[PDB]
Amino acid sequence: SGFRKMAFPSGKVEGCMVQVTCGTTTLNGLWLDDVVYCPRHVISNHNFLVQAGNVQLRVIGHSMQNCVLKLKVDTANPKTPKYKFVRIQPGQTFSVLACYNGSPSGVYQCAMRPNFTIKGSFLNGSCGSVGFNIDYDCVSFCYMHHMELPTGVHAGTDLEGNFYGPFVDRQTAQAAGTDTTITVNVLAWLYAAVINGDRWFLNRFTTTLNDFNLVAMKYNYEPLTQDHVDILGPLSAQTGIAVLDMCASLKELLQNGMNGRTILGSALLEDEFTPFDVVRQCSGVTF
C-alpha cells in the first residue's frame, strides 16, 4: 500500500556527472564513454576544464550537435552504463538528477508538460542536469536542462540538442504557452486510487469519448484519444471500471470538485503519473 511520486534509482546516472568550466561559466556535463555532453551555452580544447570528482579530464576534441556541445575526452568513463538517447512526448514522465558543480544533490520525478516545459526545482548552477528513465539495465537519457523561464518553469533539450518546445538558448523574451492537464495521466491516477481502496468518486454512469472531450476542453484538459483509451485497457480490466465509466467520474469531479475529500492524499487531480508508472508502482518492477 501507499502511493508516492517515485523516481528511478539514480546510481547509474550519478557515475556519469562531471563539472564543465569554460571561462567564467560553470555547469554540469554527462560523461558517457569518451564524450562529455553539456549545454552549448557554456561557451580550443584546453579552454574547456572538465572535472570528474577530484580528477581533471583532458579535452582532446570538440563538436556541436544542435544546442549540445560534445567534448571528446582522453578517458572513457569506466562507470558508463548501458544507455540510449530517447526523445520523449508531452505527458511522459522521467527522473531528474539535479546537480551543481558536477555533484548530484537530489533526485525527483516529473513530467514533460503539454506546453513542453517541466515544473522542476533548479537553482543557478543546475544547467546540464539530466532527465532519464530505466528499462531493465538500460538508462534512456531524455532531457538535459538549459534554462528557467520567467514563470519559474524549466526548458531544455533531448540528448541530441533539440529543444522540447518553441524555445531558444539565449536571454530573450520567452514565455511558456498556456498549459493543460494531462488527461490520460489523471485517469491512470484515478485507477491507482481504486487499487488502493479509494472509491468514493465512482458512479454508475458511462459516457462517450466525444462528450467527454467536449467537457474536458472546457477545463483546459488535453483531448483523450482512442490510443489513450487502449493504453488504459489493463487498468480497466484489473479494476472492472471501463475507461468511459472512469471518464464519467472525472467529468463529475470537474463540474463539482471534491467536496472537502481527497484522493490519494491530494485535493487536486494529479497528472504526473502515466498509465505505465501506475502499473509499475502497483506491481514491483526492479532494476
Added chain:
Amino acid sequence: SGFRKMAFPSGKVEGCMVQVTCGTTTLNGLWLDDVVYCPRHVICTSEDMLNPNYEDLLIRKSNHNFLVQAGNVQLRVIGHSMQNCVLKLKVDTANPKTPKYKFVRIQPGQTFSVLACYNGSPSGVYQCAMRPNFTIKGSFLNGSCGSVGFNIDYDCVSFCYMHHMELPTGVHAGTDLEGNFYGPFVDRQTAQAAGTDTTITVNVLAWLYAAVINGDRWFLNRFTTTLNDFNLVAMKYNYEPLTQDHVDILGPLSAQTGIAVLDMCASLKELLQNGMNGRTILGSALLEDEFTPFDVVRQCSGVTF
C-alpha cells in the same frame, strides 16, 4: 525557482542492497563492510508471526541456512547474531562499495529518502517523513521488507530506517539500524494500530517560509499571536504543538524573509480557519508537512524573490 519533494541520490545505497533468504522467506538486506543487516522476521513462517519466539527460532539455525545474494554472486555467511529486531549476518566478503556511513535514530517530523527494493534489487526512490505517530506513509508491496531510509549529508550516508511491516490502515512501521522500532510496534502480527496522526506544525511553517522565498505572500496577515494562543487553535485542527525549540529552529528562515515566527504562526491560524479559496501554495491545495526547516534551507535559494 520551483519546489519539489526531492530525495537524495540513491547510488551510495544501491551498492549495499542484497537479497536474504531463509527457508521460504525472501527479503532485502543492507551489506556494509562484512555484515548484512536485515529484519529478524526473515527466520519466521507466517504461522510464527502471531507469537514468534525469535531466540528459540534463531538457536535452531546455522550459517548455511541463510542465503545471501549480491547481484549474481552468493555471499558466504560465517556468523550470525541478533540485535533487538535486526539480524546481523557476518559474511566472508567486505562490501567494496561500502560508502562512508553512520546509523542515526531520527525523531518524528524528520524526513528521509527511501530506496524501495524487492529481491535485493532497487526499484524506486521517494522522500518521506517520520509521522508524529511513528509510522511512515510509504509505498511498499510484499517483498519490500529490509528496504532502507537514509539521508546523505556531505558524502556520509546516515541510515535511519529499515522497513519491517505494513499496518491495517496501509501505513508502514520499522526500526532504526540498531533494531529498535519507531513507535509502540512489535514484529508480531498482533492487533496493533497506528495512533491518531497529527500535522507536523514546524514543517508546515518551514514550507510557508519556502513559499515566501519563492515570491508568494497572499496568505500573510497583519496579526501576530502568542505561542500559547497558537497552540490552543492548532490543536483543534489536529496539529502538533509548536514548542520553543521549533521557534528557535525557524530563526534563520525568519531572519531571511523578515517575517517573525509568531507572525507566520498568525498566517497559519488564518489559513486553517479560511482554507485556500481556490488558491495554491507552491502548487499545492493542502498544507504540506513533509519538508523540514533544514530541507527548505537546503533546496531554496538564499535570495528571496
